[PDB]
C-alpha cells in the first residue's frame, strides 16, 4: 500500500492494531530516521501524525525458511514491562520482490546495556536501587510471558528498554521467542553468547523456560560486576568460565542438562565462592539471589515470580522508597491473576500492605 504527502514527508499506511480483533485503520507518521539495529531488526523512529507520539518501527524480512513467530507472540502480550505493539503492517520493502513485516512499537529511548556501559566508562557501579528496579521489572515480565508458556530465548541487556526518567523497564525483541511444548524439541543454539544457559551450550533440544532465568542471572551479575560474568567466543570458552565459578557440574547435574555427557570424566574444579566473585561491598542479598538463579540444574533455578518475592527486592516494597531524581517508583504491585497463576500465595509477599488500594 503506502503513500507520500506533505504536512515534512508524511507516510500513510493501512495498519492493523496490535490488540483486539483485526480491524485495520489508516495510520500516518512523519519524521522518519533509522535509530537502532539488531542481528535481525532494522528499527526506525517516527512521529505519529494524529497524536504526535514517538514510535519505533521494526522492519524485519519475513524469511519463509524460518519459523516467524514474532508477530503472533507479540499480539497476545499486554503487560507494563513488555514493549507495546501498537500496530503492524506489510510493505514491499527493498529486496525487489520480498515480504517485509513492520511492527509499530512504543518508542523507548535507552537500554539496560547502554546505561550499564555509562557506568563502566566512568568506573562507577550502577547504584543498587536501579539494579533492584531493573531486575525486578525483568522478572515480572518473565513471570507474565512464562504464564502463557512462552520462552523469550534472547534475554540480554540490549533487549531491555529503559525510560531512565521513570525507571520503567520494557522487555523487547521477541523474534526468538517460542511457546515451548514438552515433548517437542527445540533448536539448541539459541540465545546470545555470554547469556546462554549451560544446558544450551551442551546442545540440549529439550530445554524449558528456565533458560530465561539463567539469562536474567547473567544480567544481574553483569550489573553487579560491570562486565559480563561468562565471556568467551565459543561454547567451550563460556563453559570454562561457568565452571571456574560454579565448579565442575556433578554427574546428576550433567544429566539434568544433557544426558549425552554423563559418561565423560571431566576434571573436578573447585567452585569459587560467590562472595569473592563480586566486589567486597556487594549486598549479600544480591549475591544470594544470583546464586539461586545461576544454577546448573534447570529445575533448581527460581521461577521468575519467586525471584520477585526475594529479599533483595525488599527495599522496593517500602512505602517511603523514592528514586534518586525525586519521582516516585513506577507501578510495581499491580499483579493480575494471570501473572500470579504460577504460585498465587506469593501475593502475601508481592503486594505489600500499603499497595492494596
Amino acid at each position: 500500500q503506502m503513500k507520500v504527502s506533505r504536512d515534512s514527508k508524511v507516510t500513510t499506511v493501512v495498519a492493523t492494531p496490535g490488540q483486539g480483533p483485526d480491524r485495520p485503520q489508516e495510520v500516518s507518521y512523519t519524521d522518519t530516521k533509522v535509530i537502532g539495529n539488531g542481528s535481525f531488526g532494522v528499527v526506525y523512529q517516527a512521529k505519529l501524525c494524529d497524536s504526535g507520539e514517538l514510535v519505533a518501527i521494526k522492519k524485519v524480512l519475513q524469511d519463509k525458511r524460518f519459523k516467524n513467530r514474532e508477530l503472533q507472540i507479540m499480539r497476545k502480550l499486554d503487560h507494563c514491562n513488555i514493549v507495546r505493539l501498537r500496530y503492524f503492517f506489510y510493505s514491499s520493502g527493498e529486496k525487489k520482490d520480498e515480504v517485509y513485516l513492520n511492527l509499530v512499537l512504543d518508542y523507548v529511548p535507552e537500554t539496560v546495556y547502554r546505561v550499564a556501559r555509562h557506568y563502566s566508562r566512568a568506573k562507577q557501579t550502577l547504584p543498587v536501587i536501579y539494579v533492584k528496579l531493573y531486575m525486578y521489572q525483568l522478572f515480572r515480565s518473565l513471570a507474565y510471558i512464562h504464564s502463557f508458556g512462552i520462552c523469550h530465548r534472547d534475554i540480554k541487556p540490549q533487549n531491555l528498554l529503559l525510560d531512565p526518567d521513570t525507571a520503567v523497564l520494557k522487555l523487547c525483541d521477541f523474534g526468538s521467542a517460542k511457546q515451548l511444548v514438552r515433548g517437542e524439541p527445540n533448536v539448541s543454539y539459541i540465545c546470545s553468547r555470554y547469556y546462554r544457559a549451560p544446558e544450551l551450550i551442551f546442545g540440549a533440544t529439550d530445554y524449558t523456560s528456565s533458560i530465561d532465568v539463567w539469562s536474567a542471572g547473567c544480567v544481574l551479575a553483569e550489573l553487579l560486576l560491570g562486565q559480563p560474568i561468562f565471556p568467551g567466543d565459543s561454547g567451550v570458552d563460556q563453559l570454562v568460565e561457568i565452571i571456574k565459578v560454579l565448579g565442575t557440574p556433578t554427574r546428576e547435574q550433567i544429566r539434568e542438562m544433557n544426558p549425552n555427557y554423563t559418561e565423560f570424566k571431566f576434571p573436578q574444579i573447585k567452585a569459587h565462592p560467590w562472595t569473592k566473585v563480586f566486589r567486597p561491598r556487594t549486598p549479600p542479598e544480591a549475591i544470594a539471589l544470583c546464586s539461586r538463579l545461576l544454577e546448573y540444574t534447570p529445575t533448581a533455578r527460581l521461577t521468575p515470580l519467586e525471584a520477585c518475592a526475594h529479599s533483595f527486592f525488599d527495599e522496593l516494597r517500602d512505602p517511603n522508597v523514592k528514586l534518586p531524581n525525586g519521582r516516585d517508583t513506577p507501578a510495581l504491585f499491580n499483579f493480575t491473576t494471570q501473572e500470579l497463576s504460577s504460585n498465587p500465595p506469593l501475593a502475601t509477599i508481592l503486594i505489600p500492605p500499603h499497595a492494596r488500594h
Binding site: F40, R65, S176, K178, Y189
Partner: peptide
C-alpha cells in the same frame, strides 16, 4: 542465535 527451521 536464530529460530528453528520450518
Amino acid at each position: 542465535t536464530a529460530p528453528s527451521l520450518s
